Design an enzyme around this catalytic site. Structure first.
Site, mmCIF file in Angstrom:
data_model
loop_
_atom_site.group_PDB
_atom_site.id
_atom_site.type_symbol
_atom_site.label_atom_id
_atom_site.label_comp_id
_atom_site.label_asym_id
_atom_site.label_seq_id
_atom_site.Cartn_x
_atom_site.Cartn_y
_atom_site.Cartn_z
ATOM 1 N N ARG A 1 0.831 -1.193 0.000
ATOM 2 C CA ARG A 1 0.000 0.000 0.000
ATOM 3 C C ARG A 1 0.872 1.252 0.000
ATOM 4 O O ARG A 1 1.862 1.344 0.734
ATOM 5 C CB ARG A 1 -0.953 0.010 1.201
ATOM 6 C CG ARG A 1 -0.293 0.258 2.558
ATOM 7 C CD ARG A 1 -1.333 0.498 3.638
ATOM 8 N NE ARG A 1 -2.234 -0.644 3.766
ATOM 9 C CZ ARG A 1 -3.472 -0.574 4.245
ATOM 10 N NH1 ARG A 1 -3.967 0.594 4.642
ATOM 11 N NH2 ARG A 1 -4.218 -1.671 4.317
ATOM 12 N N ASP B 1 12.457 8.685 -9.998
ATOM 13 C CA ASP B 1 12.178 7.942 -8.781
ATOM 14 C C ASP B 1 12.970 6.629 -8.748
ATOM 15 O O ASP B 1 12.487 5.602 -8.276
ATOM 16 C CB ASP B 1 10.675 7.691 -8.663
ATOM 17 C CG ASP B 1 10.225 7.468 -7.229
ATOM 18 O OD1 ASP B 1 11.059 7.582 -6.293
ATOM 19 O OD2 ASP B 1 9.019 7.202 -7.036
#
Ligand SMILES: O=C1C=C2C[C@]3(O)COc4c(ccc(O)c4O)C3=C2C=C1O
Length: 334
Positions: A46, A155
């Protein structure tokens, strides 16, 4: 009389010479596939921007990974979708298989190829000097490819690099921060994870480029060869650069702020203080020794440069002696 402008020294105008709509993701219109083809099997992770599941395509019992987005601007979602489509089929880029509308959150859900990943916190389990060269080279394949397609990943980190070690199979993933490069444009510096942010972000220099991914990559390299992840571990963004200075020295850093006329926070200088440049040798000890060579050291050092323009490009990086063996046995007659 603010900062000095900068341009990428390679792949500068790749977008300038694409038709619009290659890079105009706002314009993009999604063709939705069928949600009912996929069955969620188990949650993997998550995040703030998504929830990620392993799933099965019931039409053919193929495993897939579905990324269900949290409620979010159309624009940010098209950006990620457009970049995944533009890069689809490129070396070591994660393959977007389909796009569906999750029938419960009514949110777009992205469907990618499945990769049997070994988690990086455990991968270092018998992970040799050669493994590191090979996977580093694999990452460079991807970076060179997306940079040459006018795209910054922004990223790069261990977690966004999936490896099926058994098959020596790697994919660069999570393109939700990725952006098209336009020379002269001023980007948002709230990108990348803290440990992997380049000096340019930490000092609020917004006109950066592909070069940022190479810094994040050196960070990854350092942590792997020195067995210390993350390598630069600051408690915030300010301290993050303090951690880099303690290794790279404050001389080189203030030379960098001079050259681009960057102007630092009041007593940002306070916490930076004054630091000697360290020899990469001081991070070598008896449990990382075998991962370390002069070629690893020289390569590393040409990645972690304050000045973005002076870092290796991904292409140049691939040409380094560090990769000589890796290049040799990727030469196959077929
Ligand atoms: O294209 C992809 C593909 C994946 C597959 C996968 O790597 C599985 O597992 C994940 C994850 C992201 C976050 C996370 O926490 C997690 O466990 C994934 C992705 C993100 C992407 O953009």
């Amino acid at each position: 009389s603010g900062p000095v402008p900068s341009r990428a020294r390679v792949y500068t105008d790749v977008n300038t010479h694409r038709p619009r709509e290659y890079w105009d993701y706002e314009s993009h219109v999604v063709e939705w596939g069928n949600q009912d083809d996929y069955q969620l099997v188990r949650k993997l992770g998550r995040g703030k921007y998504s929830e990620v599941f392993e799933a099965i395509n019931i039409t053919n019992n193929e495993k897939v990974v579905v990324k269900i987005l949290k409620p979010v601007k159309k624009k940010k979602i098209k950006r990620e979708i457009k970049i995944l489509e533009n890069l689809r089929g490129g070396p070591n880029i994660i393959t977007l298989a389909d796009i569906v509308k999750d029938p419960v959150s009514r949110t777009p859900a992205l469907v990618f190829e499945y990769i049997n990943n070994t988690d990086f916190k455990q991968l270092y389990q018998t992970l040799t000097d050669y493994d590191i060269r090979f996977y580093m080279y694999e990452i460079l394949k991807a970076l060179d490819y997306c940079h040459s397609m006018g795209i910054m990943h922004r990223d790069v980190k261990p977690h966004n690099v999936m490896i099926d070690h058994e098959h020596r199979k790697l994919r660069l993933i999570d393109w939700g921060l990725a952006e098209f490069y336009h020379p002269g444009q001023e980007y948002n510096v709230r990108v990348a994870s803290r440990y992997f942010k380049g000096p340019e972000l930490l000092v609020d220099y917004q006109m950066y480029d592909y070069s940022l991914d190479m810094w994040s990559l050196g960070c990854m390299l350092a942590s792997m060869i020195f067995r210390k992840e993350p390598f630069f571990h600051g408690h915030d963004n300010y301290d993050q650069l303090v951690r880099i200075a303690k290794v790279l020295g404050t001389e080189d850093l203030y030379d960098y702020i001079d050259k681009y006329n960057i102007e630092l926070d009041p007593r940002f200088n306070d916490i930076l203080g004054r630091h000697s440049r360290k020899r990469w040798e001081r991070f070598v000890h008896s449990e990382n020794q075998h991962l370390v060579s002069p070629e690893a050291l020289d390569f590393l050092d040409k990645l972690l440069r304050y000045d973005h323009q002076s870092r290796l490009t991904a292409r140049e990086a691939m040409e380094h002696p560090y990769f000589y063996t890796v290049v040799k046995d990727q030469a196959r007659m077929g």
